[PDB]
RNA sequence: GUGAGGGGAGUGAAAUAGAUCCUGAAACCGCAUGCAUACAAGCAGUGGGAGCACCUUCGUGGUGUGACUGCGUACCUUUUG
RNA sequence: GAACCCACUGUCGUUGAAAAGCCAGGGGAUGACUUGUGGAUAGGGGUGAAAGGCUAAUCAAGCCUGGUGAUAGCUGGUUCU
RNA sequence: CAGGUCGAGUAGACCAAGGCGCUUGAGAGAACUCUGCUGAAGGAACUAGGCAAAAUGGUACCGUAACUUCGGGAGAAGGUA
RNA sequence: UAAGUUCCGACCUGCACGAAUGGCAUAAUGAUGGCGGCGCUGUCUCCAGCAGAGGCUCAGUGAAAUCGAAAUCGCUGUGAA
RNA sequence: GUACUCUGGGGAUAACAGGCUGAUACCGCCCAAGAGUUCAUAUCGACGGCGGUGUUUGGCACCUCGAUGUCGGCUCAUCUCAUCCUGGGGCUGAAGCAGGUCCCAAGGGUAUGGCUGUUCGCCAUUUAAAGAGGUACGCGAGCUGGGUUUAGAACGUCGUGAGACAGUUCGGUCCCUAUCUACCGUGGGCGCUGGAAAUUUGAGAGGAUCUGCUCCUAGUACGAGAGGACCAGAGUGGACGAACCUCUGGUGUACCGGUUGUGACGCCAGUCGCAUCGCCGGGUAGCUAUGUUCGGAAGGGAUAACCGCUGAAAGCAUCUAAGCGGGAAGCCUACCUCAAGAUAAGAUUUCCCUAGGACUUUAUGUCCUCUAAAGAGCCGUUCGAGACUAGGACGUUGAUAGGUUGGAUGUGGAAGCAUAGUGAUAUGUGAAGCUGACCAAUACUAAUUGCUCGUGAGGCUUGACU
């Protein structure tokens, strides 16, 4: 349940460490983004000498949330943090490592690489 | 907020046309035979042929 | 809304309400016939009758529960010595509530609360 | 169309083979009994009148007693009518019954009921009005209506203005529900989703009109 | 059994009859049926039971685990067919029904003493 | 209620002269009788006008009411108005 | 930092519990400090770490009584045919 | 003038001696208003303005920058039992 | 700052700074003015539940400002507009 | 000089809003030098001309000075069309994709932030789109009070001074319990051709009406390539709305436990009062969103611009004058809810009442005696119904409420007694004890004997059958 001004951890090694959501994309008056939704973010903290810098405006996809996702059998899965992965202008993943676990809501032609490089898919 | 015109006695009585009182439900008791309010103990302590104060 | 809710308020705090109902139960057990207002009388059943039910088995734990609820040693003794054996064979309905007109001071409806086998 | 009158029994879930959980509502059905058939010649329209349930003799009036005795069925707790056509009118006679076997699994139906009563309610709950600020100097106006009109032109309040008033306790129809189970031994319908009303309320089930 | 008899009768027809006995504070392994395409496989979820609700067909239990640095909790519906198997590995010893205080502890502080028969 | 207040009896020319008591107006508030009034829009009247009730010299009379209908935006002041 | 002396913010109150308050927070608290009793300064005067502040709920000149029925090219009102 | 248990204390919680339950009540448990408690995910996006709320808070020990009129800043910040 | 009519440093064609109606600075102090952070939160997205006091019903007591008179509807036009 | 101010007057006279007017403003049209490789008119269009609207800047001084009391924000709106999106078309300097221009169309929809008191504007990032206007520049007896415009103080400037401002800066009291109209809900009375219990038709009214992306047709038509469709299908979203509580959560001051201080119950043990529910951890029902499910689907009828068929006036031509068609998110239906006070008061099924006297005003006439029906209400136990009402269930031929018994749930190892320890404490008896609102049984307690209202066959005329 990510909205504007929410801070998120960065779950790859693109260089960014903390990002802030500034827009939820995909409709007029759209309120919230969940796992698998695209957001606009600004970079608040980054690794020195990286390809990304502080003050950059970028696209991202939400991978973990604290509010949680529902499953068809009635179950809910909740994580301890809110995390995102950075995308380029064409909305493709642009990182060479992923940190932590991931979900099945990214089984989509847009998002194979995160699953392929992720250590654990729970 | 207050009235701009004094209200006529006719309209005042028309408003009061709903203020009438109504009668209670009264019933003659069996064992003793005086009137009492229905479903209540009589003023002398009887109800349905039982006494409360001997 | 108050859909399916139980309990009363009677314009009192919760501690005041609980203490007042304990006082009413103690007075009822002492005198066996009291006069009160109708809502208080109807609510008094849910407080007083379980005490009589509990006093049917004379054990130390039951006596201590009765004391924790009433805080009156004379009431506990009466409950476990007189009233319990009296109602041993009766399945509930130890009280009787009868409407008794209205009160002069504020026209409040009133009622009598009496034990079933008083005399 | 021709339908059934039942009672709402409560909500539960059904698990499928794949593991999916389907929320369902249970409707208890006492087989409906036909009391009167209305025709074009006598009434000017075609409908079937049914009754269901039970009622004690001290509560059944003499007029209703004669009305039921003419049909030859026991007195129920309610009487209802279904508008029908000539094709549906085939096979129906006074004294016959209609059961749950009228429906089949997988069929789409509409369910009508009486919604729960919320009593006197204000703008926020009734019409989704927005509250004013809780701080920053606001005096005594948090959940109030606000403005209710313009000015000397037109100098009045229009009809249909949204204000405070009674909410709930209305007839409501939910369309497009799906039949999940037709239990004939227990005389029960199990339908996917929620239906209007509280447990114990009377509900009507009909074939869907959005066909 | 707080519901109507018909609802109880309809619910009772779907109950599982082979569940183990377990309590909050135990550590369990749950086998979850995963259907990718039409590949069927079983994924193991290992963790600590921190909450358990007993409501008949509506029974549930919550399992918390640390996976590669990030904590994760899953609420399982007990009678769902997607729950294939539950195995108890170690029985814990706690003082309460709900162990939500573990969410604020890490590692050294989050250990549960083993119950000894 | 050993109250307040009243009803008889009695005094007085008179008590509806009975004590904040000669006469006892109007605003205002009751009870009783007669007629009208719950499908119809506004300064409330005015010119017509059926019916009803009582009285009666029995009418081309009297008293009360006014279904229906034509016309009709208070008074004073100050103002070009 | 309590008593005591003040009066910075907010809600409430505004035909108030109150013709200046209550509640929650706030400042000084051995000093150019707070306070009781009794005295002194009187109206174009007094007093003022100075706001035209205060001088009995009244202050760019207090209150009371007299001149006095001040004057008003202004507003209102002005009674039977 | 002013006691007990803790307490640095005349602060504070509960009590003693001694005083009281504040001169309308009884029900109900709608909108809306006042005063409170809790709140998923987010955390100033509110607003003229973080207004109001939330937050910090004791004792002992360790440790503490620029700047300085060498007194301070300073309980700086921060940490332990 | 993603985005800064405010803020901070600098530039100097100062509409109309400037040296006891003092000029340029300055440690400490301020319920003083402006700007930015950490923590924290119902300020907000967007409100929900609960507790007390009113509101509402019954018995008792019993105000207020206002008021030419009222048998006191909409629309379009007219008309001291 | 007065912003420290005061009195008598004026809507005879200004600032706000209204009114008249329309110079100005905005929108439309006429002529057409020219521009557009030729070609005035695909698109622009000089020099000149004619109108419409009542948004701008103004003109006048008709209303209000015995008061019409606010620049923005908030909340809540309603209308126009000169249309921002979506829908239907003509032309094109229209290959396709796109665009330009004009015509029809008002059903629905139509951003969040940074700066500033701002309206406006600029900027960042979205969206199918972020339209233009009227409504006292809508809305302050609905909220605020940042700006302006009282009293304090300062700077620049002006004045000898009191003081002042095509200026700036810091601070600075927002009253009213709603009579009438209007509106949102909810009742009482009477009427509806004797009365009553139910079920109903529908004149009519209200609600709803939005839209993105992906796949398929098809890398096909088209195109030198780069690119790339019409029509016609499937799926999944955003915003909005409704109902619901099985699932996920919140709350849950009458449920369970841990623990601090103090007082008491004679004492230990065990408990209770007070401290925000003292604080802290959980949590049943109910309510609830952030949770779940569902909706705007499809189809008929008449049309708008526009496109026609046959066809003369006018031997040809021509959608029109006779005659016959197609055609839009728009209109009428269709979907949901209400609806006979629809005084035109409608329809169907069933049920109830059939007694005697006197009198004159000989009339659905008035007084006696005898009769109180079908039913409705008072009263009581109450509700997932509720301000009071109204509505639903039941009243001994009874499960309506409370209690009792059983179950379920929550919390979690009661008290007492035994063991092991110097002890704090731990283990056993035993998943025990306690458990508001839930499910099921059960007359133990309370729904008593009752009373009131509602009548006695329902005028006349004409017609068709009896």
Curated annotation (Swiss-Prot), chain B:
Listed name of the protein: Large ribosomal subunit protein bL32
A single GO molecular function term of this UniProt record: structural constituent of ribosome
Location of region: Disordered: 1-43
NCBIfam families: rpmF_bact (TIGR01031)
Keyword Ribonucleoprotein recorded: yes
Pfam families noted in UniProt: Ribosomal_L32p
Family: Belongs to the bacterial ribosomal protein bL32 family.
HAMAP family referenced in this protein's UniProt entry, alphabetically: Ribosomal_bL32
BP terms from Gene Ontology: translation
Curated annotation (Swiss-Prot), chain C:
Keyword Ribosomal protein: yes
Entries under InterPro entries matching the protein: Ribosomal_bL17, Ribosomal_bL17_CS, Ribosomal_bL17_sf
Top-level taxonomic group: Bacteria
Keyword Ligase: no
Assigned keywords, A-Z: Ribonucleoprotein, Ribosomal protein
SUPFAM superfamilies (UniProt xref): Prokaryotic ribosomal protein L17 (SSF64263)
Subunit structure: Part of the 50S ribosomal subunit. Contacts protein L32.
Protein name (record): Large ribosomal subunit protein bL17
Species this protein is from: Acinetobacter baumannii (strain AB0057)
Origin organism lineage: Bacteria, Pseudomonadati, Pseudomonadota, Gammaproteobacteria, Moraxellales
From Swiss-Prot, chain D:
Keyword Ribonucleoprotein part of the UniProt annotation: yes
PROSITE patterns: RIBOSOMAL_L3
Modified residues (N5-methylglutamine): 152
Post-translation changes: Methylated by PrmB.
Keyword annotations from UniProtKB, A to Z: Methylation, Ribonucleoprotein, Ribosomal protein, RNA-binding, rRNA-binding
Any single GO BP term: translation
Gene3D superfamilies assigned to the protein according to its UniProt record, in alphabetical order: 3.30.160.810, Translation factors
The keyword Transferase is assigned to this record: no
GO MF term list: rRNA binding; structural constituent of ribosome
Pfam families: Ribosomal_L3
InterPro entries, per the entry: Ribosomal_uL3, Ribosomal_uL3_bac/org-type, Ribosomal_uL3_CS, Transl_B-barrel_sf
One GO location term (cellular component): cytosolic large ribosomal subunit
Region feature Disordered, mapped onto this chain: 135-154
Chain's role: One of the primary rRNA binding proteins, it binds directly near the 3'-end of the 23S rRNA, where it nucleates assembly of the 50S subunit.
Record note on quaternary structure: Part of the 50S ribosomal subunit. Forms a cluster with proteins L14 and L19.
Homology family: Belongs to the universal ribosomal protein uL3 family.
Protein name: Large ribosomal subunit protein uL3
Provenance organism: Acinetobacter baumannii (strain AB0057)
Gene giving rise to this polypeptide: rplC
UniProtKB/Swiss-Prot annotation, chain E:
UniProt GO cellular component terms: cytosolic large ribosomal subunit
GO MF entries: structural constituent of ribosome
Keyword Membrane assigned: no
Pfam families attached to this UniProt entry: Ribosomal_L19 (PF01245)
Keywords recorded for this protein, A-Z: Ribonucleoprotein, Ribosomal protein
Tagged with keyword Ribonucleoprotein: yes
Gene Ontology biological process terms, A to Z: translation
Family, as annotated: Belongs to the bacterial ribosomal protein bL19 family.
UniProt-listed NCBIfam families: rplS_bact
Stated role: This protein is located at the 30S-50S ribosomal subunit interface and may play a role in the structure and function of the aminoacyl-tRNA binding site.
The protein's name: Large ribosomal subunit protein bL19
């Amino acid at each position: 349940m990510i909205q504007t001004e929410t801070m998120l951890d960065v779950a790859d090694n693109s260089g960014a460490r903390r990002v802030q959501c500034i827009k939820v994309l995909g409709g007029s008056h759209r309120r919230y983004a969940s796992v698998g939704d695209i957001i606009k973010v600004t970079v608040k903290e980054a690794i020195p000498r990286a390809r990304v810098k502080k003050g950059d405006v970028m696209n991202a996809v939400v991978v973990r949330t604290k509010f949680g996702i529902r499953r068809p059998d009635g179950s809910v899965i909740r994580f301890d943090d809110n995390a995102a992965v950075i995308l380029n202008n064409n909305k493709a993943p642009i990182a060479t490592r992923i940190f932590g676990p991931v979900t099945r809501e990214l089984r989509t032609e847009q998002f194979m690489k995160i699953i392929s490089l992720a250590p654990e898919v729970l | 907020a207050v009235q701009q015109n004094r209200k006529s006695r006719s309209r005042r009585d028309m408003r009061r046309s709903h203020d009438a009182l109504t009668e209670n439900a009264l019933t003659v008791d069996q064992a003793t035979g005086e009137t009492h309010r229905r479903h209540h103990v009589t003023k002398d302590g009887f109800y349905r042929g039982r006494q409360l104060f001997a | 809304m108050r859909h399916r809710n139980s309990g009363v308020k009677l314009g009192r705090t919760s501690s005041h309400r609980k203490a007042m109902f304990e006082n009413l139960a103690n007075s009822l057990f002492e005198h066996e016939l009291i006069k009160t207002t109708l809502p208080k009388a109807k609510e008094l059943r849910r407080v007083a009758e379980p005490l009589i039910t509990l006093a049917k088995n004379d054990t130390v734990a039951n006596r201590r529960l009765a004391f924790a609820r009433t805080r009156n040693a004379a009431t506990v003794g009466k409950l476990f010595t007189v009233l319990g054996p009296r109602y041993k064979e009766r399945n509930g309905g130890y009280l009787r509530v009868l409407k008794a007109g209205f009160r002069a001071g504020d026209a409040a409806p009133m009622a009598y609360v009496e034990l079933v086998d008083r005399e | 169309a021709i339908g059934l009158v039942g009672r709402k029994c409560g909500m539960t879930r059904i698990f499928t083979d794949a593991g999916v959980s389907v929320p369902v509502t249970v409707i208890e059905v006492d087989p409906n009994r036909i009391t009167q058939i209305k025709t074009l010649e006598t009434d000017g329209y075609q409908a079937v009148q049914v009754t269901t349930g039970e009622r004690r003799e001290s509560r059944v009036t003499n007029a209703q007693k004669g009305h039921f005795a003419k049909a030859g069925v026991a007195a129920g707790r309610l009487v209802k009518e279904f508008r029908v056509t000539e094709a549906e009118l085939e096979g129906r006679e006074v004294g016959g019954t209609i059961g749950v076997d009228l429906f089949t699994v997988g069929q789409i139906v509409d369910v009508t009921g009486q919604s729960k009563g919320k009593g006197f309610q204000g703008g926020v709950k009734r019409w989704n009005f927005r509250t004013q600020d809780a701080t920053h100097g606001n005096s005594v106006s948090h959940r109030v209506l606000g403005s209710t009109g313009q000015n000397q032109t037109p100098g009045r309040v229009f009809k249909g203005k949204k204000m405070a008033g009674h909410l709930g306790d209305e007839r409501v129809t939910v369309q497009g529900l799906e039949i999940v189970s037709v239990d004939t031994e227990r005389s029960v319908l199990v339908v996917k989703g929620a239906i209007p009303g509280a447990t114990g309320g009377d509900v009507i089930v009909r074939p869907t009109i959005k066909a | 059994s707080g519901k109507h008899p018909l609802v109880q009768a309809i619910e009772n027809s779907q109950l599982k009859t082979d569940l183990p006995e377990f309590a909050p504070g135990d550590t369990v392994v749950v086998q979850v049926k995963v259907k990718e395409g039409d590949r069927e496989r079983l994924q193991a979820f290992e963790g600590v039971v921190i909450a358990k609700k007993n409501r008949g067909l509506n029974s549930a239990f919550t399992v918390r685990k640390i996976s590669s640095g990030v904590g994760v909790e899953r609420v399982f519906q007990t009678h769902s067919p997607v729950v294939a198997k539950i195995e108890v590995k170690r029985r814990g010893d706690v003082r309460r029904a709900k162990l939500y205080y573990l969410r604020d502890l890490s590692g050294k502080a989050a250990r549960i003493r083993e119950k000894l028969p």
